[PDB]
Amino acid sequence: SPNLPPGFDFTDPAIYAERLPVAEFAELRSAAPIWWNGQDPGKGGGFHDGGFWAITKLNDVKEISRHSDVFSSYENGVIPRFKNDIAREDIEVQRFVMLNMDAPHHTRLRKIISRGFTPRAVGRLHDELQERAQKIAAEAAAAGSGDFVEQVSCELPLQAIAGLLGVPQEDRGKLFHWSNEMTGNEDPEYAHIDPKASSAELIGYAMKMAEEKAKNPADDIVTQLIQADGEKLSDDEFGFFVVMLAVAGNETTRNSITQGMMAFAEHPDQWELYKKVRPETAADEIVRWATPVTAFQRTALRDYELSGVQIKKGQRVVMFYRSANFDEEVFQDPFTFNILRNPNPHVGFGGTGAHYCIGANLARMTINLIFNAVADHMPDLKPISAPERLRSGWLNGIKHWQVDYTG
Amino acid sequence: SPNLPPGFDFTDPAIYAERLPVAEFAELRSAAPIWWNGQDPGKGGGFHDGGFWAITKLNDVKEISRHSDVFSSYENGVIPRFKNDIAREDIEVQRFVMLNMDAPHHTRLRKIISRGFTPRAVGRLHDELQERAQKIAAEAAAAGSGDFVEQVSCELPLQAIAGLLGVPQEDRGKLFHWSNEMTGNEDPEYAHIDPKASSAELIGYAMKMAEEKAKNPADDIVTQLIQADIDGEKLSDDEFGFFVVMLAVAGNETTRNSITQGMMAFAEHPDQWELYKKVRPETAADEIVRWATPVTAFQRTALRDYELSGVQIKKGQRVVMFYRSANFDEEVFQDPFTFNILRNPNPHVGFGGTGAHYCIGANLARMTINLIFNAVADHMPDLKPISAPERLRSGWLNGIKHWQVDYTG
């Protein structure tokens, strides 16, 4: 039995509102790398099965991710924590997006959606995103100091979304608002916000966009998505595409930027090296270090033995990427922030398999462009005060972080 | 060979600004109960000796505290962490107060000053602190919501200091100001306040008090301390100043943080809060202090070679007593991670290890705790927190700067 407090729950949002439980994950890797995480009645964050298998080793994460035929995303979704009193109906709605589907449905959507994440679609946004990154960093440097999350981390990921969807500048303000309103709904700072209403607004805007583009086809992703190659996103599916993209492409990359800069602030030797060399390998080490998604879950569709543990049909497994990305048997000096690290087989974008992050290259470009812009415009920036973390059971978020850009 | 990241330092203020390193402390207790905590050059929080011995077990904490003739408070003081660039002299000025003295100097001062903190002397403040506690809780309940630290935790410990000293009401504002000016000095929120200057202010005021009481003796505490006793012993004028400084500092943040973290414990354990409201048990104060452990760690310096639980402590080496670890020692408490306000016996070391330096204010602190929680139970029994607390950056103090709570619930 691992040396943990009685009743300890790795999906407890109260933990992540304070800290990442690095030491507790290290104890699991050392003493029980696949450990049953029991959950008292009504304290399962919306699931009522008594607990889940905590997965803490990178190889087990990869095994679960590659065996999607067995470990299902559709069955219970991939988010392993909601409000304890959430309604099952409000969990199953997740199934309307590609992330929480199984083959064959998922296979079909994935193939169509790939049209929007080709090296062309991504690479074409480089010049505008580079321009926007440089302006953002310039604006922050002129301000002298402020909330790094709002002034440096937030905009560029959202502009990458808008650019990819070809959203007109006039509607980006409201688009960004709706996207943000579906973030951090479990944290008291946002407890007054109705995310269901914002999702309905996004779906609506997405439909006008798809209908408008059907009548006026152009050389851009949305038209490629509603156009038939005879496979094409249905009007509805395109709305759920936008919702999923407005959500998946926002907080995760944002939080990679905040926590990457926190890493640089704590390891100035790495910041001095970065500013000189600008290594393209930095983005992956920032994603490994930041692990913006702490965990996604799966559900066993049949009995499966994983590293000597008998997982039973119907049981949940929770893949703790935050643990796996510091696996002492995979990484040399996992607790060293090393922007030259290469190869870097982290699972911050998930394990290799059917659901691997389709936006990983877009995320890497966003990260490299903003940090290049930070190095260009505020090379001497230093933190003012401690970051404020997000209350979430599965997202690793930084809400606010005060920084002095002039140093 | 504990399972810790390379370079981990248990006195690193950056840790405590975020969290209490509970799991890391537990790993030491399990795999290396006495462990050399190496510190790089220039990262010893004012000390330049390569590191210190981490003490994580309760019996070890007590053995060190009982053997004060070996483990000195004077050689390097008891605070284990300052700003890295602190001058040595600024560390050595600590020795002017009882806490950082060794026998025989300490023995005499403790004998004289203890007269002001007896059960009787403490009991004298009960009524005025009870009335104040009730008013504090009423005024907070009426505000509906706010920062629990400021509205409930901060004032009553300061009024206990002023009451013990007999400070006129008109002077309490500036007394509280200088007392707080010597707090939160390693945290960016209060990085712009000078401790040494304020200590001079406190000392100057104490001189005016001693000078006045020599002219108009009264039946209070300042007069007793400046009056020769039956054995011809008394605090000198300088000694009285450092007593006020010691009191103004020692009676403030620690009790404040026991109240804040006691209420946090109650909020995370609603069954215990219901029991407290119904029963108001006399064991709750000690369990609150065990859970809060407001002083995370105090240090000693070995005056000679000493073998401690099979480890060889060499002369000149520092040992750091981590009360935060000892108070959750699984061998002493069967269920340390249970918050049990009926815990009895409760051999916690929140007030230190028994010995020559055991907190003389423990009875005063327990009364302050009991009075304010009785008042909270009376006036806002349904309070619940709004947002997460904001912790204090410090290498040895366990502090909560702010905590928003809905008193009405």
Added chain:
Amino acid sequence: GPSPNLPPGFDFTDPAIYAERLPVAEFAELRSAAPIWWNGQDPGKGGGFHDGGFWAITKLNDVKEISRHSDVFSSYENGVIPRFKNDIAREDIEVQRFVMLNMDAPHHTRLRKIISRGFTPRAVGRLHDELQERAQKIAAEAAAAGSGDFVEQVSCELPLQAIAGLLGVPQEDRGKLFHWSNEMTGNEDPEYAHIDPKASSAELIGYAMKMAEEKAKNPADDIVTQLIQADIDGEKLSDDEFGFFVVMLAVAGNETTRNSITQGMMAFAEHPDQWELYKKVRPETAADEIVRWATPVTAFQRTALRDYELSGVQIKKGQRVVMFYRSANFDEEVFQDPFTFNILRNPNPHVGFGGTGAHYCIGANLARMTINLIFNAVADHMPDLKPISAPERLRSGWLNGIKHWQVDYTG
């Protein structure tokens, strides 16, 4: 005068030449008929440089004049290596500006001053006894094998142990230090087609920055403490600067000294009277005649920062000049009988370590001591060695390398 008698399109940096031979007669033809000569290069055939060609510098006095006028002849503008793979990306040339070799003043001046703390005569002399011990063991191990690859069993190890000893690299880490060092060069030869110098450099820098951090806490007697402790003016190598220093060393003092050893013994095998004299007298002047004969760095380049007239030839701003040390070290106007291998040659003003000036090899005396120590050990343990077959040369446009050389140590 007439044009030099060279094949049309001949390129003195062509790696395909050096994989087979040293172009000795071609260099001699330039010295006689066109001592400063425009080496044209066809589109896409410039080894990473796309400017139409360069000036071939073949006379020792011209090499010295360029090396001394570093204010005009820049190392930083295009780096000093004159040949990479034809398709190398410009960004992969410019990243090499982070080592001291490819820096101009004032950045070069500061770094060299700091680095000098690690190459004092005292620091290098402190390595004499350990390197002597290891040389004798190397030669004894080789002789006990009876026959084998002289490059691998005699030439390779001592230069790497010199680097390791200078830096104070623990014994358990020397294996990977040596691996990283060997992965830095040769990538144009089919034998090394799979090496990744970018990756090697990154792993070395990461290792080196960790060592810098560790050795700040516990200072040792190596040069690392000297390099990373600030002086009065606060001058010291940063951790990443120490990393680029280690990269520079792992490169600059590995294959160069190795190839001096291999070609020194190649020369002794062709000149047995010199070998008999060496065994008898053990003259340390041999090390400099060996470096002159071996010229392990065939050529380094510079770039003109302004128009400059050099021995009657108008060099134009922006043009590259390539200093062919291999030609200058056989310059008939400086050396008496340059094509005689003479281990007593004295004075021996060769430019195998470069021309005097700002970038002159800081490791020259460590190199000479390594050479004298290994050849004493070879003389002591295999005085009768004899080659079995012909050396295999390295495909490089600027390094004069021997990959393999089979020899019978017992004779």
